[PDB]
Design a protein around this motif. Structure first.
Motif, mmCIF file in Angstrom:
data_model
loop_
_atom_site.group_PDB
_atom_site.id
_atom_site.type_symbol
_atom_site.label_atom_id
_atom_site.label_comp_id
_atom_site.label_asym_id
_atom_site.label_seq_id
_atom_site.Cartn_x
_atom_site.Cartn_y
_atom_site.Cartn_z
ATOM 1 N N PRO C 12 -19.676 -8.365 -1.125
ATOM 2 C CA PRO C 12 -18.488 -8.464 -1.991
ATOM 3 C C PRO C 12 -17.536 -7.282 -1.820
ATOM 4 O O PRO C 12 -17.237 -6.546 -2.764
ATOM 5 N N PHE C 13 -17.046 -7.093 -0.592
ATOM 6 C CA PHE C 13 -16.084 -6.021 -0.349
ATOM 7 C C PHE C 13 -14.759 -6.297 -1.044
ATOM 8 O O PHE C 13 -14.114 -5.371 -1.550
ATOM 9 N N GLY C 14 -14.332 -7.561 -1.073
ATOM 10 C CA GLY C 14 -13.105 -7.898 -1.773
ATOM 11 C C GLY C 14 -13.185 -7.628 -3.262
ATOM 12 O O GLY C 14 -12.172 -7.332 -3.900
ATOM 13 N N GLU C 15 -14.388 -7.726 -3.834
ATOM 14 C CA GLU C 15 -14.580 -7.370 -5.235
ATOM 15 C C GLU C 15 -14.321 -5.887 -5.473
ATOM 16 O O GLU C 15 -13.920 -5.495 -6.576
ATOM 17 N N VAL C 16 -14.523 -5.054 -4.453
ATOM 18 C CA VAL C 16 -14.398 -3.606 -4.584
ATOM 19 C C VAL C 16 -12.998 -3.151 -4.193
ATOM 20 O O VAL C 16 -12.294 -2.520 -4.990
ATOM 21 N N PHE C 17 -12.586 -3.466 -2.962
ATOM 22 C CA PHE C 17 -11.309 -2.970 -2.454
ATOM 23 C C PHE C 17 -10.127 -3.611 -3.170
ATOM 24 O O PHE C 17 -9.153 -2.928 -3.506
ATOM 25 N N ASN C 18 -10.183 -4.921 -3.403
ATOM 26 C CA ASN C 18 -9.068 -5.649 -3.992
ATOM 27 C C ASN C 18 -9.248 -5.887 -5.488
ATOM 28 O O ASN C 18 -8.781 -6.904 -6.011
ATOM 29 N N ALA C 19 -9.910 -4.971 -6.189
ATOM 30 C CA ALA C 19 -10.051 -5.113 -7.631
ATOM 31 C C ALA C 19 -8.741 -4.756 -8.320
ATOM 32 O O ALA C 19 -8.009 -3.867 -7.878
ATOM 33 N N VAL C 42 -13.438 -5.715 10.736
ATOM 34 C CA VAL C 42 -12.393 -6.445 10.025
ATOM 35 C C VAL C 42 -11.954 -5.663 8.799
ATOM 36 O O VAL C 42 -10.808 -5.783 8.351
ATOM 37 N N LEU C 43 -12.850 -4.849 8.239
ATOM 38 C CA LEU C 43 -12.475 -4.004 7.114
ATOM 39 C C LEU C 43 -11.550 -2.880 7.562
ATOM 40 O O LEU C 43 -10.623 -2.504 6.835
ATOM 41 N N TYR C 44 -11.782 -2.342 8.764
ATOM 42 C CA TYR C 44 -10.915 -1.294 9.294
ATOM 43 C C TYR C 44 -9.483 -1.785 9.465
ATOM 44 O O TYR C 44 -8.538 -1.001 9.323
ATOM 45 N N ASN C 45 -9.301 -3.074 9.752
ATOM 46 C CA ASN C 45 -7.985 -3.637 10.021
ATOM 47 C C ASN C 45 -7.479 -4.560 8.918
ATOM 48 O O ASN C 45 -6.359 -5.070 9.027
ATOM 49 N N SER C 46 -8.264 -4.784 7.859
ATOM 50 C CA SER C 46 -7.855 -5.706 6.802
ATOM 51 C C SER C 46 -6.613 -5.233 6.056
ATOM 52 O O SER C 46 -5.885 -6.064 5.503
ATOM 53 N N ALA C 47 -6.355 -3.927 6.028
ATOM 54 C CA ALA C 47 -5.164 -3.385 5.392
ATOM 55 C C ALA C 47 -4.710 -2.158 6.171
ATOM 56 O O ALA C 47 -5.278 -1.808 7.211
HETATM 57 C C1 LIG Z 1 -7.671 -7.650 0.268
HETATM 58 O O1 LIG Z 1 -6.582 -8.576 0.150
HETATM 59 C C2 LIG Z 1 -5.749 -8.687 1.312
HETATM 60 C C3 LIG Z 1 -4.641 -9.648 0.952
HETATM 61 O O2 LIG Z 1 -5.133 -10.724 0.165
HETATM 62 C C4 LIG Z 1 -6.584 -9.161 2.495
HETATM 63 O O3 LIG Z 1 -5.766 -9.219 3.658
HETATM 64 C C5 LIG Z 1 -7.751 -8.209 2.721
HETATM 65 O O4 LIG Z 1 -8.582 -8.696 3.767
HETATM 66 C C6 LIG Z 1 -8.573 -8.058 1.441
HETATM 67 N N1 LIG Z 1 -9.645 -7.095 1.639
HETATM 68 C C7 LIG Z 1 -10.938 -7.389 1.458
HETATM 69 C C8 LIG Z 1 -11.907 -6.276 1.718
HETATM 70 O O5 LIG Z 1 -11.307 -8.502 1.096
#
Ligand SMILES: *[C@@H]1O[C@H](CO)[C@@H](O)[C@H](O)[C@H]1NC(C)=O
Lengths: 212, 219, 207
Positions: C12-19, C42-47
């Motif tokens: 649940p990385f999105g739960e942490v980074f995109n909270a 993919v985390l290195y390049n996700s943002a």
């Molecule tokens: C956080 O959200 C952005 C935009 O919705 C997305 O591109 C990115 O992959 C997300 N990061 C994670 C760790 O889920």
């Protein structure tokens, strides 16, 4: 690091007026990390305001601070006789913490032109091997005054040292001395030794000179 | 009480060492941010060093590697060990506590003076400033002494064994290229009493034990 | 030629980074990650992060590794306070708020969040400990609101001279300088505990 430029250099006011002191930072500084300090000659700094607007305990209500970003202000609504000192601002939000160069709060009075006295090097000191010519400016206001040495109508720069007294307790004036130091050989080279003084209280520059 | 009392300041030459002390009461040094701030003669304030309550220490870039800050909780005192001192380190050093955003630096010591110079303690030469010619402005005339080439600070100057204190200006000392301090002390007197009253200086220099009394008169 | 556990869950990385909301640095959040797969490239390049620094391991080589548990720590600090989130560093944050061990193996991720954590009148919801008697041990969380005793007189729980509340607010306004603006920080800790590894990279097994 962060440079705090205070303005004006010296602020000349009479007791009762409102004083406005400016502190301009080279970078944006959060208002919570700006302080104001007061220092009197020979004493330690006294904290006035921290957080740009919070007074330290024991500071009267006439002191107030404001500002944000790069422009900050210390305001004394009604000046008291004990408020004439040097004031520094300080930022402590970015390492290293830095101070401003200080603003001098000086008692203002009527313009007083100076008495100009000139002294040739004493015959005793002439034996020593060096010559010291002294030009005295006695009891004047304001402090802004130009003192130019002229040796045979030649503007002499680089061998003079000025010394100024603090503002007097009674008449609130300044006195200044300028010492021209030469060798005995160079002192015998020339003839006319003049001291030209430009001041606000003088309609035209006055010059005291002597011949060797 | 709430006082910070400083000591250890004095005179030293380039390279020598010095330890400043800062004794506290009403404030525990090991429970506060403790800082050192210095002020060179005639200049502004410059932060020097800080020690945290947890032990972390930070120094200015100009004194890093040469200074060391420490504390003794048993004595409740703060220290600043300075080694390899330089001529630019000559300043009045203050210790103070920092409250940061909670109240700034609210307690300051009285200051201790540190002087770094390679000159030798030397008595002053005194020369007369004779009131040449009339020296008249509206009727007055001026005269004084020239206290040249001495080290170290300070000197005391009075006139006629302290009898004359009206219209006397004793300027502040000036540091010369030689490393010695120089001084002048003038007085303004009526030109009518030039030949009447005699004027004599009274120069005293404790660090070198020199007492000179020069008599100034027209020439 | 390659063999990893049969783990299907995504971490649940999105739960942490995109909270939507992060924690104050003095009360940092710790998310325990176990029984899942994560791709760190993919985390290195996700943002577009401002700092993505790894210690010991490397993000590219990190996909080839399994760990018993991975710990994720999140909080908010100032811009020029991010440099204290590193091994062997000192400061108000490292000493009294969040401390990394000197032998730290992991990555610290930070990115500006001025548009999220700055309010017009000032966001005073993010706090930080200013006064503490001693440093923090690594991965220690001190949430005490005891009145800090700076003098010799006990405080009895009332504020005054030498008796100061130990927590202070960041003045997070969108017009702050770059060093004064809020930065969301994520710290990733990798733990090998002589146990079944349950957090692996995205490598597919053969036979
Ligand atoms: C956080 O959200 C952005 C935009 O919705 C997305 O591109 C990115 O992959 C997300 N990061 C994670 C760790 O889920």
């Amino acid at each position: 690091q962060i440079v705090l430029t205070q303005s004006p250099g010296t602020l000349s006011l009479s007791p009762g007026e409102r004083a406005t002191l400016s502190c301009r930072a080279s970078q944006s500084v959060s208002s919570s990390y700006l302080a104001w300090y007061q220092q009197k000659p020979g004493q330690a700094p006294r904290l006035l305001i921290y957080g740009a607007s919070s007074r330290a305990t024991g500071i009267p209500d006439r002191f107030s601070g404001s500002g944000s970003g790069t422009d900050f202000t210390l305001t004394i609504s009604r000046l008291e006789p004990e408020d004439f000192a040097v004031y520094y601002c300080q930022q402590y939000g970015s390492s290293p913490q830095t101070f401003g160069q200080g603003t001098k709060l000086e008692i203002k009075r009527t313009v007083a032109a100076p008495s100009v006295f000139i002294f040739p090097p004493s015959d005793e000191q002439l034996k020593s091997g060096t010559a010291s010519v002294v030009c005295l400016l006695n009891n004047f206001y304001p402090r802004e005054a130009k003192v130019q040495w002229k040796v045979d109508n030649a503007l002499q720069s680089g061998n003079s040292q000025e010394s100024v007294t603090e503002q007097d307790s009674k008449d609130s004036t300044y006195s200044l001395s300028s010492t021209l130091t030469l060798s005995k050989a160079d002192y015998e080279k020339h003839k006319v030794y003049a001291c030209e003084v430009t001041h606000q209280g003088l309609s035209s520059p006055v010059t005291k000179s002597f011949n060797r | 009480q709430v006082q910070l009392v400083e000591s250890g300041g004095g005179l030293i030459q380039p390279g020598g060492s010095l330890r400043l002390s800062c004794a506290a009461s009403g404030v525990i040094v090991s429970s506060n941010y403790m800082s050192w701030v210095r002020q060179a003669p005639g200049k502004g304030l410059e932060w020097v060093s800080v020690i945290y309550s947890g032990g972390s220490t930070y120094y200015a870039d100009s004194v890093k590697g040469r200074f060391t800050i420490s504390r003794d909780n048993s004595k409740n005192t703060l220290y600043l060990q300075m080694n390899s001192l330089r001529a630019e380190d000559t300043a009045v050093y203050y210790c103070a506590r920092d409250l940061d955003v909670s109240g700034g630096m609210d307690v300051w010591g009285q200051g201790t003076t540190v002087t770094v110079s390679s000159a030798s303690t030397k008595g002053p030469s005194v020369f007369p400033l004779a009131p040449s010619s009339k020296s008249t402005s509206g009727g007055t005339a001026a005269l004084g002494c020239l206290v040249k080439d001495y080290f170290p600070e300070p000197v005391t100057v009075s006139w006629n064994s302290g009898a004359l204190t009206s219209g006397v200006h004793t300027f502040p000392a000036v540091l010369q290229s030689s490393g010695l301090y120089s001084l002048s002390s003038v007085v303004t007197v009526p030109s009518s009493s030039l030949g009447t009253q005699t004027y004599i200086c009274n120069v005293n220099h404790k660090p070198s034990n020199t007492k000179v009394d020069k008599k100034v008169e027209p020439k | 030629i390659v063999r990893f556990p049969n783990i299907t869950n995504l971490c649940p990385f999105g739960e942490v980074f995109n909270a939507t909301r992060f924690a104050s640095v003095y009360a940092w959040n710790r998310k325990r990650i176990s029984n899942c797969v994560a791709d760190y490239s993919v985390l290195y390049n996700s943002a577009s992060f401002s700092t993505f620094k790894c210690y010991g391991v490397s993000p590219t080589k990190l996909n080839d590794l399994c760990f018993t548990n991975v710990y994720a720590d999140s909080f908010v600090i100032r811009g020029d306070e991010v440099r204290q989130i590193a091994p062997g560093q000192t400061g108000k944050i490292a000493d009294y708020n969040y401390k990394l061990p000197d032998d730290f193996t992991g990555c610290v991720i930070a990115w500006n969040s001025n548009n999220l954590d700055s309010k017009v009148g000032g966001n005073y919801n993010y706090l930080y400990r200013l006064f503490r008697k001693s440093n923090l041990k690594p991965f220690e969380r001190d949430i005490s609101t005891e009145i800090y005793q700076a003098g010799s007189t006990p405080c009895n729980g009332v504020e005054g001279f030498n008796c100061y509340f130990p927590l202070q607010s960041y003045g997070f306004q969108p017009t702050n300088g770059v060093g004064y603006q809020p930065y969301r920080v994520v710290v990733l800790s990798f733990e090998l505990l002589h146990a079944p590894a349950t957090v692996c990279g995205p490598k597919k097994s053969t036979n």
